[PDB]
Amino acid sequence: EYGYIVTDQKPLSLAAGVKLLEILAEHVHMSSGSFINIAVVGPALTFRIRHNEQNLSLADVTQQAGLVKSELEAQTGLQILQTGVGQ
Amino acid sequence: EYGYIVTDQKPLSLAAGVKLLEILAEHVHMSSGSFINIAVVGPALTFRIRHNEQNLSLADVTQQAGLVKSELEAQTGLQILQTGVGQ
Ligand SMILES: [Ca+2]
């Protein structure tokens, strides 16, 4: 499984994808360095999460990305079209 | 916002789509009639959720869909490739 965020960017830059992860990390109180297997592919950011004490899951992180969607958009200048988990 | 389930069937049939919703409903102990605004679009099923006695959310229902993906697949023959929330 991997997490993803689909944006309106064609294509999404690597820098912007990492900024999304920085904001998300701050909200889930973890190091942005706990996001692994990162790539941007077309308009999408994909990632996994490293083992952690907190037991934070991909589910948890994508739910969180919905909770703070407005903040993610405001701080990055992009639009988030989908957030989910792929197989 | 809407919830979605992306399959490996293009076009996804409406009947197959709502069969996914029935299995999902059984799993989360909600009536499938609480899934509203339903459409199939390409390989995807999209929906929203009405007031329900269980007070359940889109992130929660789509996370659960991810959890029971092998059941959804065993019962329908579809593969579930993504689950998430869109705008
Ligand atoms: Ca928006």
Coordinates of N, CA and C and ligand atoms in Angstrom, one line a residue:
Chain A
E1 N 0.9 -1.2 0.0 CA 0.0 0.0 0.0 C 0.9 1.3 0.0
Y2 N 0.4 2.3 -0.7 CA 1.0 3.6 -0.7 C -0.1 4.7 -0.5
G3 N 0.3 5.8 0.1 CA -0.6 7.0 0.2 C -0.4 7.9 -1.0
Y4 N -1.4 8.6 -1.4 CA -1.2 9.6 -2.4 C -2.1 10.8 -2.2
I5 N -1.6 11.9 -2.8 CA -2.4 13.1 -2.9 C -2.3 13.5 -4.4
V6 N -3.5 13.7 -5.0 CA -3.6 14.2 -6.4 C -3.8 15.7 -6.4
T7 N -3.0 16.4 -7.0 CA -3.1 17.9 -7.1 C -3.6 18.3 -8.5
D8 N -3.7 19.6 -8.6 CA -4.1 20.2 -9.9 C -2.9 20.6 -10.7
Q9 N -1.7 20.2 -10.3 CA -0.4 20.6 -10.9 C -0.1 19.7 -12.0
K10 N 0.4 20.2 -13.2 CA 0.6 19.3 -14.4 C 2.0 19.6 -14.9
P11 N 3.1 18.9 -14.4 CA 3.1 18.0 -13.3 C 3.4 18.6 -12.0
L12 N 3.2 17.9 -10.9 CA 3.6 18.3 -9.6 C 5.1 18.3 -9.4
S13 N 5.7 19.4 -8.9 CA 7.1 19.4 -8.7 C 7.4 18.6 -7.5
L14 N 8.7 18.1 -7.4 CA 9.2 17.4 -6.3 C 9.2 18.3 -5.1
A15 N 9.7 19.5 -5.2 CA 9.7 20.5 -4.1 C 8.3 20.7 -3.5
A16 N 7.3 20.8 -4.3 CA 6.0 21.1 -3.8 C 5.4 19.8 -3.1
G17 N 5.7 18.7 -3.6 CA 5.3 17.4 -3.0 C 5.9 17.3 -1.6
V18 N 7.2 17.6 -1.5 CA 7.8 17.5 -0.2 C 7.3 18.6 0.8
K19 N 6.9 19.8 0.3 CA 6.3 20.7 1.2 C 5.0 20.2 1.7
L20 N 4.2 19.6 0.9 CA 2.9 19.0 1.4 C 3.3 18.0 2.6
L21 N 4.3 17.2 2.4 CA 4.7 16.3 3.4 C 5.2 17.0 4.7
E22 N 5.9 18.1 4.5 CA 6.3 18.9 5.7 C 5.2 19.3 6.5
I23 N 4.2 19.9 5.9 CA 3.0 20.4 6.6 C 2.3 19.3 7.3
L24 N 2.1 18.2 6.5 CA 1.4 17.0 7.1 C 2.1 16.5 8.3
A25 N 3.5 16.4 8.2 CA 4.3 15.8 9.3 C 4.0 16.7 10.5
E26 N 4.0 18.0 10.4 CA 3.8 18.9 11.5 C 2.5 18.7 12.2
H27 N 1.5 18.4 11.4 CA 0.2 18.1 11.9 C 0.0 16.7 12.6
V28 N 0.8 15.7 12.1 CA 0.8 14.4 12.7 C 1.9 14.2 13.8
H29 N 2.5 15.4 14.1 CA 3.6 15.5 15.1 C 4.7 14.5 14.9
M30 N 5.2 14.3 13.6 CA 6.3 13.4 13.3 C 7.3 14.2 12.4
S31 N 8.4 13.6 12.3 CA 9.4 14.1 11.4 C 9.0 13.8 10.0
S32 N 9.1 14.9 9.1 CA 8.9 14.7 7.7 C 9.8 13.6 7.1
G33 N 10.9 13.4 7.8 CA 11.8 12.3 7.4 C 11.2 10.9 7.6
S34 N 10.1 10.8 8.3 CA 9.4 9.5 8.4 C 8.5 9.1 7.2
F35 N 8.4 10.0 6.3 CA 7.8 9.7 5.0 C 8.9 9.2 4.0
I36 N 8.6 8.0 3.5 CA 9.6 7.3 2.7 C 9.0 6.8 1.3
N37 N 9.8 6.3 0.5 CA 9.3 5.8 -0.8 C 8.6 6.9 -1.6
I38 N 9.2 8.1 -1.5 CA 8.5 9.3 -2.1 C 8.7 9.4 -3.5
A39 N 7.6 9.8 -4.3 CA 7.8 10.1 -5.7 C 6.7 11.1 -6.0
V40 N 6.9 11.9 -7.0 CA 5.8 12.7 -7.7 C 5.7 12.1 -9.1
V41 N 4.5 11.9 -9.5 CA 4.1 11.2 -10.8 C 3.0 12.0 -11.4
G42 N 3.1 12.6 -12.5 CA 2.1 13.5 -13.0 C 1.6 14.5 -12.0
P43 N 0.3 14.6 -11.7 CA -0.2 15.5 -10.7 C -0.1 15.0 -9.3
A44 N 0.4 13.8 -9.1 CA 0.3 13.1 -7.8 C 1.6 13.0 -7.0
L45 N 1.4 13.1 -5.7 CA 2.5 12.8 -4.7 C 2.2 11.4 -4.2
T46 N 3.2 10.5 -4.1 CA 3.0 9.2 -3.5 C 4.0 9.0 -2.4
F47 N 3.7 8.2 -1.4 CA 4.6 8.0 -0.3 C 4.2 6.8 0.5
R48 N 5.1 6.4 1.4 CA 4.8 5.4 2.5 C 5.3 6.1 3.8
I49 N 5.0 5.4 4.9 CA 5.5 5.9 6.2 C 6.4 4.9 6.9
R50 N 7.4 5.4 7.5 CA 8.4 4.5 8.1 C 7.8 4.1 9.4
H51 N 8.2 2.9 9.9 CA 7.9 2.4 11.2 C 7.9 3.5 12.2
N52 N 7.0 3.6 13.2 CA 7.0 4.6 14.3 C 6.4 4.1 15.6
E53 N 6.8 4.7 16.7 CA 6.3 4.4 18.0 C 4.8 4.7 18.1
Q54 N 4.4 5.8 17.5 CA 3.0 6.4 17.6 C 2.0 5.5 17.0
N55 N 2.4 4.5 16.2 CA 1.5 3.6 15.5 C 0.6 4.4 14.4
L56 N 1.2 5.4 13.8 CA 0.6 6.2 12.8 C 0.6 5.5 11.5
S57 N -0.6 5.3 10.9 CA -0.8 4.5 9.7 C -1.0 5.4 8.5
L58 N -1.0 4.8 7.3 CA -1.4 5.5 6.0 C -2.8 6.0 6.1
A59 N -3.7 5.2 6.6 CA -5.0 5.6 6.9 C -5.1 6.9 7.7
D60 N -4.4 6.9 8.8 CA -4.3 8.0 9.7 C -3.8 9.2 9.0
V61 N -2.7 9.1 8.2 CA -2.1 10.2 7.5 C -3.1 10.8 6.4
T62 N -3.7 9.9 5.6 CA -4.6 10.5 4.6 C -5.9 11.1 5.2
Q63 N -6.4 10.6 6.3 CA -7.5 11.2 7.0 C -7.0 12.6 7.5
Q64 N -5.8 12.6 8.0 CA -5.3 13.9 8.5 C -5.1 14.9 7.3
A65 N -4.7 14.4 6.2 CA -4.6 15.3 5.0 C -5.9 15.9 4.6
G66 N -7.0 15.2 4.8 CA -8.4 15.8 4.6 C -8.7 16.8 5.7
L67 N -8.4 16.5 6.9 CA -8.6 17.5 8.0 C -8.0 18.8 7.8
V68 N -6.7 18.8 7.3 CA -6.0 20.0 7.1 C -5.9 20.4 5.6
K69 N -6.8 20.0 4.8 CA -6.8 20.3 3.3 C -6.6 21.7 3.0
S70 N -7.4 22.6 3.8 CA -7.4 24.0 3.5 C -6.0 24.6 3.8
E71 N -5.4 24.1 4.8 CA -4.0 24.6 5.2 C -3.0 24.1 4.2
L72 N -3.1 22.9 3.8 CA -2.2 22.4 2.7 C -2.3 23.2 1.5
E73 N -3.5 23.5 1.0 CA -3.7 24.3 -0.2 C -3.2 25.7 0.0
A74 N -3.5 26.4 1.1 CA -3.1 27.8 1.4 C -1.6 27.9 1.4
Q75 N -0.9 26.9 1.9 CA 0.5 27.1 2.1 C 1.3 26.6 0.9
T76 N 0.8 25.9 0.0 CA 1.5 25.4 -1.2 C 1.0 26.1 -2.5
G77 N -0.1 26.7 -2.5 CA -0.7 27.3 -3.7 C -1.2 26.3 -4.7
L78 N -1.5 25.1 -4.2 CA -2.1 24.2 -5.1 C -3.4 23.7 -4.6
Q79 N -4.1 23.0 -5.5 CA -5.4 22.4 -5.1 C -5.3 20.9 -5.0
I80 N -5.9 20.3 -3.9 CA -5.9 18.9 -3.7 C -7.2 18.3 -4.2
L81 N -7.1 17.5 -5.2 CA -8.2 16.9 -5.8 C -8.7 15.5 -5.3
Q82 N -7.7 14.8 -4.8 CA -8.0 13.5 -4.2 C -6.9 13.2 -3.2
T83 N -7.3 12.4 -2.2 CA -6.3 11.9 -1.2 C -6.8 10.4 -0.9
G84 N -5.8 9.5 -0.9 CA -6.2 8.1 -0.8 C -5.1 7.2 -0.6
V85 N -5.4 5.9 -0.7 CA -4.5 4.8 -0.5 C -4.6 3.9 -1.7
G86 N -3.5 3.6 -2.4 CA -3.4 2.7 -3.5 C -2.8 1.4 -3.2
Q87 N -3.1 0.4 -4.0 CA -2.5 -0.9 -3.8 C -1.5 -1.2 -5.0
Chain B
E1 N -17.2 17.2 -1.4 CA -16.3 16.0 -1.4 C -17.1 14.7 -1.6
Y2 N -16.4 13.7 -2.2 CA -17.0 12.4 -2.5 C -16.0 11.3 -2.1
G3 N -16.5 10.2 -1.8 CA -15.7 9.0 -1.6 C -15.6 8.2 -2.9
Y4 N -14.5 7.5 -3.1 CA -14.4 6.7 -4.3 C -13.6 5.4 -4.1
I5 N -13.9 4.4 -5.0 CA -13.3 3.2 -5.0 C -12.9 3.0 -6.5
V6 N -11.6 2.9 -6.8 CA -11.1 2.7 -8.2 C -10.9 1.2 -8.3
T7 N -11.4 0.6 -9.4 CA -11.3 -0.8 -9.7 C -10.4 -1.0 -10.9
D8 N -10.2 -2.3 -11.2 CA -9.5 -2.7 -12.5 C -10.5 -3.0 -13.6
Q9 N -11.7 -2.5 -13.5 CA -12.7 -2.8 -14.5 C -13.1 -1.4 -15.2
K10 N -12.9 -1.3 -16.5 CA -13.2 -0.1 -17.2 C -14.0 -0.4 -18.5
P11 N -15.2 0.0 -18.6 CA -16.0 0.7 -17.6 C -16.6 -0.2 -16.4
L12 N -16.6 0.3 -15.2 CA -17.2 -0.4 -14.1 C -18.7 -0.3 -14.3
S13 N -19.4 -1.5 -14.1 CA -20.8 -1.5 -14.2 C -21.4 -0.9 -12.9
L14 N -22.6 -0.3 -13.1 CA -23.3 0.3 -11.9 C -23.7 -0.8 -10.9
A15 N -24.2 -1.9 -11.5 CA -24.6 -3.0 -10.6 C -23.4 -3.5 -9.8
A16 N -22.2 -3.7 -10.4 CA -21.0 -4.1 -9.7 C -20.6 -3.1 -8.6
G17 N -20.7 -1.8 -9.0 CA -20.4 -0.7 -8.1 C -21.3 -0.8 -6.8
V18 N -22.6 -1.0 -7.0 CA -23.4 -1.0 -5.8 C -23.3 -2.3 -5.0
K19 N -22.8 -3.4 -5.7 CA -22.5 -4.6 -5.0 C -21.3 -4.3 -4.0
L20 N -20.3 -3.6 -4.5 CA -19.2 -3.2 -3.6 C -19.8 -2.4 -2.4
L21 N -20.7 -1.5 -2.6 CA -21.3 -0.8 -1.5 C -22.1 -1.7 -0.6
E22 N -22.8 -2.7 -1.1 CA -23.5 -3.6 -0.2 C -22.6 -4.3 0.7
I23 N -21.5 -4.9 0.2 CA -20.5 -5.6 1.0 C -19.9 -4.7 2.1
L24 N -19.6 -3.4 1.6 CA -19.0 -2.4 2.5 C -20.0 -2.1 3.6
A25 N -21.3 -1.8 3.2 CA -22.3 -1.5 4.2 C -22.5 -2.6 5.3
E26 N -22.4 -3.9 4.8 CA -22.6 -5.0 5.7 C -21.4 -5.0 6.7
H27 N -20.2 -4.7 6.2 CA -19.0 -4.7 7.1 C -19.0 -3.6 8.1
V28 N -19.5 -2.4 7.7 CA -19.5 -1.3 8.7 C -20.8 -1.1 9.4
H29 N -21.7 -2.0 9.3 CA -23.0 -2.1 10.0 C -23.8 -0.8 9.7
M30 N -24.0 -0.5 8.4 CA -24.8 0.6 8.0 C -25.7 0.1 6.9
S31 N -26.9 0.6 6.7 CA -27.7 0.3 5.5 C -27.0 0.8 4.3
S32 N -27.0 0.0 3.2 CA -26.4 0.6 2.0 C -27.2 1.7 1.4
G33 N -28.5 1.9 1.8 CA -29.3 3.0 1.4 C -28.7 4.4 1.9
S34 N -27.8 4.4 2.8 CA -27.1 5.6 3.3 C -26.0 6.1 2.4
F35 N -25.7 5.3 1.4 CA -24.8 5.7 0.3 C -25.6 6.4 -0.7
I36 N -25.3 7.7 -1.0 CA -26.1 8.5 -1.9 C -25.2 9.2 -3.0
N37 N -25.8 9.9 -3.9 CA -25.0 10.6 -4.9 C -24.1 9.6 -5.6
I38 N -24.6 8.4 -5.9 CA -23.8 7.4 -6.5 C -23.7 7.6 -8.0
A39 N -22.5 7.3 -8.5 CA -22.2 7.3 -9.9 C -21.0 6.3 -10.1
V40 N -21.0 5.7 -11.3 CA -19.8 5.0 -11.8 C -19.2 5.8 -12.9
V41 N -17.9 6.0 -12.9 CA -17.2 6.9 -13.8 C -15.9 6.2 -14.2
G42 N -15.8 5.7 -15.5 CA -14.6 5.0 -15.9 C -14.5 3.7 -15.0
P43 N -13.4 3.5 -14.4 CA -13.2 2.3 -13.5 C -13.6 2.6 -12.1
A44 N -14.2 3.7 -11.8 CA -14.4 4.1 -10.4 C -15.9 4.2 -10.0
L45 N -16.1 3.9 -8.7 CA -17.4 4.1 -8.1 C -17.2 5.4 -7.2
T46 N -18.2 6.3 -7.3 CA -18.1 7.5 -6.5 C -19.5 7.6 -5.7
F47 N -19.4 8.2 -4.5 CA -20.6 8.3 -3.6 C -20.4 9.3 -2.5
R48 N -21.5 9.6 -1.9 CA -21.5 10.4 -0.6 C -22.2 9.6 0.4
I49 N -22.3 10.2 1.6 CA -23.0 9.4 2.7 C -24.0 10.4 3.4
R50 N -25.2 9.9 3.6 CA -26.3 10.6 4.2 C -26.2 10.4 5.7
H51 N -26.9 11.3 6.5 CA -27.2 11.1 7.9 C -27.4 9.7 8.2
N52 N -26.7 9.1 9.1 CA -27.0 7.7 9.5 C -26.8 7.5 11.0
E53 N -27.5 6.4 11.5 CA -27.6 6.2 12.9 C -26.2 5.9 13.5
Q54 N -25.3 5.5 12.7 CA -23.9 5.1 13.1 C -23.0 6.3 13.1
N55 N -23.5 7.5 12.7 CA -22.7 8.7 12.5 C -21.3 8.4 11.8
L56 N -21.3 7.7 10.6 CA -20.0 7.4 9.9 C -19.6 8.4 8.9
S57 N -18.2 8.7 8.7 CA -17.6 9.7 7.7 C -17.1 9.1 6.4
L58 N -16.8 9.9 5.3 CA -16.2 9.4 4.1 C -14.8 8.7 4.3
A59 N -13.9 9.4 5.1 CA -12.6 8.9 5.3 C -12.8 7.5 6.0
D60 N -13.7 7.4 6.9 CA -13.9 6.2 7.7 C -14.4 5.1 6.8
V61 N -15.4 5.4 5.9 CA -16.0 4.3 5.1 C -15.0 3.9 4.0
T62 N -14.2 4.9 3.4 CA -13.2 4.6 2.4 C -11.9 3.8 3.0
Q63 N -11.6 4.1 4.3 CA -10.5 3.4 5.0 C -11.0 1.9 5.2
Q64 N -12.3 1.8 5.5 CA -12.8 0.5 5.8 C -12.8 -0.3 4.4
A65 N -13.2 0.4 3.3 CA -13.2 -0.2 2.0 C -11.8 -0.8 1.7
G66 N -10.7 0.0 2.1 CA -9.4 -0.4 1.9 C -9.0 -1.7 2.7
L67 N -9.5 -1.6 4.0 CA -9.3 -2.8 4.9 C -9.9 -4.1 4.4
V68 N -11.1 -4.0 3.8 CA -11.8 -5.2 3.4 C -11.7 -5.4 1.9
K69 N -10.6 -4.9 1.3 CA -10.4 -5.0 -0.1 C -10.4 -6.4 -0.6
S70 N -9.8 -7.4 0.1 CA -9.7 -8.7 -0.4 C -11.1 -9.4 -0.4
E71 N -12.0 -9.0 0.6 CA -13.4 -9.5 0.6 C -14.2 -8.9 -0.5
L72 N -14.1 -7.6 -0.8 CA -14.7 -6.9 -1.9 C -14.3 -7.6 -3.2
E73 N -13.0 -7.9 -3.3 CA -12.4 -8.6 -4.5 C -12.9 -10.1 -4.6
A74 N -12.9 -10.8 -3.5 CA -13.3 -12.2 -3.5 C -14.7 -12.4 -4.0
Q75 N -15.6 -11.4 -3.5 CA -17.0 -11.5 -3.8 C -17.4 -10.9 -5.1
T76 N -16.6 -10.1 -5.7 CA -17.0 -9.4 -7.0 C -16.1 -9.8 -8.1
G77 N -14.9 -10.3 -7.9 CA -13.9 -10.5 -8.9 C -13.1 -9.3 -9.4
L78 N -13.5 -8.1 -8.8 CA -12.8 -6.9 -9.1 C -11.5 -6.9 -8.3
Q79 N -10.5 -6.1 -8.8 CA -9.5 -5.7 -8.0 C -9.7 -4.3 -7.6
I80 N -9.5 -4.0 -6.3 CA -9.5 -2.6 -5.7 C -8.2 -2.0 -5.8
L81 N -8.0 -1.0 -6.6 CA -6.7 -0.4 -6.9 C -6.5 0.9 -6.0
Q82 N -7.5 1.6 -5.7 CA -7.4 2.8 -4.8 C -8.7 3.0 -4.1
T83 N -8.6 3.6 -2.9 CA -9.8 4.2 -2.2 C -9.4 5.5 -1.6
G84 N -10.4 6.4 -1.6 CA -10.0 7.8 -1.1 C -11.2 8.7 -1.2
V85 N -10.9 10.0 -1.0 CA -11.8 11.1 -1.0 C -11.4 12.2 -1.9
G86 N -12.3 12.6 -2.7 CA -12.0 13.6 -3.8 C -12.9 14.8 -3.7
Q87 N -12.5 15.8 -4.5 CA -13.3 17.1 -4.7 C -13.1 17.4 -6.2
Ligands
CA1 CA -9.7 23.1 -2.8

